[PDB]
Amino acid sequence: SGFRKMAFPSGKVEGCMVQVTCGTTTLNGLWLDDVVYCPRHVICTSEDMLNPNYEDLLIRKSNHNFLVQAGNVQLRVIGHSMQNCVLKLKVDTANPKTPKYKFVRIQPGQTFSVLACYNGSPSGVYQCAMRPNFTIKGSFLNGSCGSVGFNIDYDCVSFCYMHHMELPTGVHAGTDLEGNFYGPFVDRQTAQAAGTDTTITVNVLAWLYAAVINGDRWFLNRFTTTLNDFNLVAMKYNYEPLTQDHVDILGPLSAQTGIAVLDMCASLKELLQNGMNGRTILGSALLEDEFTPFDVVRQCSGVT
Amino acid sequence: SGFRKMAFPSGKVEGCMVQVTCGTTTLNGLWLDDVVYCPRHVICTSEDMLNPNYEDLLIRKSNHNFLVQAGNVQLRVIGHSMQNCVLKLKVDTANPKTPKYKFVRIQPGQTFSVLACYNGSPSGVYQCAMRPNFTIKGSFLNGSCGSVGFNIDYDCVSFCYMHHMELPTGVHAGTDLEGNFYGPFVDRQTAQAAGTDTTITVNVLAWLYAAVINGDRWFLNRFTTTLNDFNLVAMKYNYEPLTQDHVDILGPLSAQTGIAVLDMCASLKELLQNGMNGRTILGSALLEDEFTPFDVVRQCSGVT
Numbered sequence: 001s002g003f004r005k006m007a008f009p010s011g012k013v014e015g016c017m018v019q020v021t022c023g024t025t026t027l028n029g030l031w032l033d034d035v036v037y038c039p040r041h042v043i044c045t046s047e048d049m050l051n052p053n054y055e056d057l058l059i060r061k062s063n064h065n066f067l068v069q070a071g072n073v074q075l076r077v078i079g080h081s082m083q084n085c086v087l088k089l090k091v092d093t094a095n096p097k098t099p100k101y102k103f104v105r106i107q108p109g110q111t112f113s114v115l116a117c118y119n120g121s122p123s124g125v126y127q128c129a130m131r132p133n134f135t136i137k138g139s140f141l142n143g144s145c146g147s148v149g150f151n152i153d154y155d156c157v158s159f160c161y162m163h164h165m166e167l168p169t170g171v172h173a174g175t176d177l178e179g180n181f182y183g184p185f186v187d188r189q190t191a192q193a194a195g196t197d198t199t200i201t202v203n204v205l206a207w208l209y210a211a212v213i214n215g216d217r218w219f220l221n222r223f224t225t226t227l228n229d230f231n232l233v234a235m236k237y238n239y240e241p242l243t244q245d246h247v248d249i250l251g252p253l254s255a256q257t258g259i260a261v262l263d264m265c266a267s268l269k270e271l272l273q274n275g276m277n278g279r280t281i282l283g284s285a286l287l288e289d290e291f292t293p294f295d296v297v298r299q300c301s302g303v304t
Numbered sequence: 305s306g307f308r309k310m311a312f313p314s315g316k317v318e319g320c321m322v323q324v325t326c327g328t329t330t331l332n333g334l335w336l337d338d339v340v341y342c343p344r345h346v347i348c349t350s351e352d353m354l355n356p357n358y359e360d361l362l363i364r365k366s367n368h369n370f371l372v373q374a375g376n377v378q379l380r381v382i383g384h385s386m387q388n389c390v391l392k393l394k395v396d397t398a399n400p401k402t403p404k405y406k407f408v409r410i411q412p413g414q415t416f417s418v419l420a421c422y423n424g425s426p427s428g429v430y431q432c433a434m435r436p437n438f439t440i441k442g443s444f445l446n447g448s449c450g451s452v453g454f455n456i457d458y459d460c461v462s463f464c465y466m467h468h469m470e471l472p473t474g475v476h477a478g479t480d481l482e483g484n485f486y487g488p489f490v491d492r493q494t495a496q497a498a499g500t501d502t503t504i505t506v507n508v509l510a511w512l513y514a515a516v517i518n519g520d521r522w523f524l525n526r527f528t529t530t531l532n533d534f535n536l537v538a539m540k541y542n543y544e545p546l547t548q549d550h551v552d553i554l555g556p557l558s559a560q561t562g563i564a565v566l567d568m569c570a571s572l573k574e575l576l577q578n579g580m581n582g583r584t585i586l587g588s589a590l591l592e593d594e595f596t597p598f599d600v601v602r603q604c605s606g607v608t
């Protein structure tokens with residue numbers, strides 16, 4: 001009973017958080033095996049951020065300039081390299097708390113948990129989605145850079161995001177663990193605007209299935225629709241177009257509830273055209289799009 | 305930038321989760337030092353739950369009937385006792401992962417993180433509030449009993465909740481770690497109805513302060529009000545009455561934003577009387593009441 005915006009347990013990732021200082025700048029690092037991953041803008045001063053030349057700035061840095069601290073103990077840095085927008089600091093000690101892990105580059109619409117950190121210490125955990133415009137709507141302050149996004153399957157942590165920046169509109173941009181930004185963002189203090197933040201249609205449908213499973217059924221109607229008819233409505237409301245791939249992924253939820261995917265699409269269509277009329281769905285007065293079909297199944301079945 | 309429903313990092317609590325089996329029933333236990341805490345209904349069969357006599361049922365149980373498993377290793381049970389609605393199983397090994405901890409009984413309106421578990425294994429973490437009717441709106445399935453609610457200050461985990469049951473309306477009831485239920489609930493499979501779920505006014509005001517801090521200011525108006533005038537409106541909308549104690553607790557947020565508490569009360573009054581008019585506040589189309597004034601300060605300052 002009940003449906004909550006649930007994050008993965010953060011323990012396995014807390015044991016990886018370290019603090020990295022280079023000169024006057026301090027941010028977070030992810031320590032996996034004998035490597036510490038961090039945003040390359042740790043080498044920049046506030047003035048450098050306006051138009052940094054990272055290759056040139058990195059020439060003035062040696063292994064001893066990167067101060068890595070895990071808890072209250074200092075790690076010895078024996079190598080350093082730049083991979084896209086991240087620095088990989090080879091230390092002399094493998095992290096004894098390294099969980100089973102993978103580096104994954106997620107697609108927009110996918111969700112993940114963020115362990116927000118400051119000075120290598122965890123402050124909190126929350127659930128995010130990679131928006132269709134490749135930004136994330138997080139909660140990050142100065143010092144939170146190097147905080148990571150991740151998913152967990154059984155005992156394996158799939159790291160997918162590393163926080164780098166905030167756009168002037170209060171949204172967040174970052175990279176995967178190979179240092180490649182999601183979207184067209186650059187690690188420079190320059191005005192970078194986000195594109196249209198469209199709604200993740202398949203996630204909304206998944207959340208409507210979660211609602212039916214938990215007893216909120218008022219929005220179920222007598223109508224059905226087609227993929228093409230639904231998508232005409234989706235385009236109008238800035239919703240992502242729904243494909244047969246999205247329909248396939250909703251299969252298990254459709255099977256459990258007995259409500260055909262296209263019937264749920266017709267309920268969503270009426271919700272878009274008429275609104276909620278002052279009503280709520282799973283304690284929300286808007287259509288929630290940051291639960292994937294996999295998140296709904298996991299939460300509704302008790303996957304540990 | 306940004307404001308999220310953030311949970312505390314769960315690692316310190318993950319290291320405490322164990323599985324407890326008694327006969328055919330399996331639920332979660334909290335292992336702190338050499339004691340495992342769990343709901344006393346672990347001794348019940350499905351038939352027992354209708355009208356259990358826990359003292360009588362416990363007579364037929366010995367130390368060897370409580371199977372405690374931490375990960376994949378079995379703990380030896382050397383003592384057992386019932387304290388209110390929890391069982392305290394003395395084991396022969398102190399939990400090496402026991403964090404600094406306290407047992408606190410929270411007041412309604414206070415928030416906490418829940419580490420939902422099944423079979424001693426963590427499934428996810430989310431943020432809850434103790435409702436004014438002493439229920440919590442969680443996400444729990446069969447097997448989640450024994451999952452705990454907690455807050456963290458620096459390195460000390462304050463455990464405040466242990467999950468016991470779901471009411472027929474899909475809301476949740478449980479105890480503090482001394483086994484005392486929050487509210488009037490009993491650990492019996494009997495129809496127990498919740499009272500009015502009133503809105504936590506001080507939390508809504510705290511969240512409006514968080515919104516102003518993050519740039520959502522459209523709801524700020526030219527009005528002010530008094531505690532008595534505001535409370536006439538609060539009574540009408542099933543909001544908790546606001547006291548000078550609530551005003552005092554909002555002091556630091558009032559000081560940071562420069563918006564007097566009674567002015568923010570007048571904005572909230574207009575929001576209650578006029579609605580949102582299709583607009584959003586911090587990505588929400590309703591007035592969020594599960595952030596305390598302390599949660600807003602912590603998130604807005606970066607407390608680790």
Ligand SMILES: Cc1ccncc1NC(=O)[C@@H](c1cccc(Cl)c1)C(C)C
Pocket residue numbers: 041049140141142143144145164165166167186187188189190305
């Ligand atoms: C202040 C903040 C709040 C939340 N998240 C991150 C930051 N940090 C920055 O946005 C930094 C930044 C700007 C532009 C590009 C890059 Cl790579 C980094 C810096 C301007 C302080």
Ligand SMILES: Cc1ccncc1NC(=O)[C@@H](c1cccc(Cl)c1)C(C)C
Pocket residue numbers: 001345353444445446447448449468469470471490491492493494
């Ligand atoms: C099924 C579920 C889902 C979510 N949270 C808890 C449960 N568990 C119960 O509600 C149990 C229960 C009922 C009445 C009293 C007590 Cl102490 C325990 C039992 C009826 C299965």
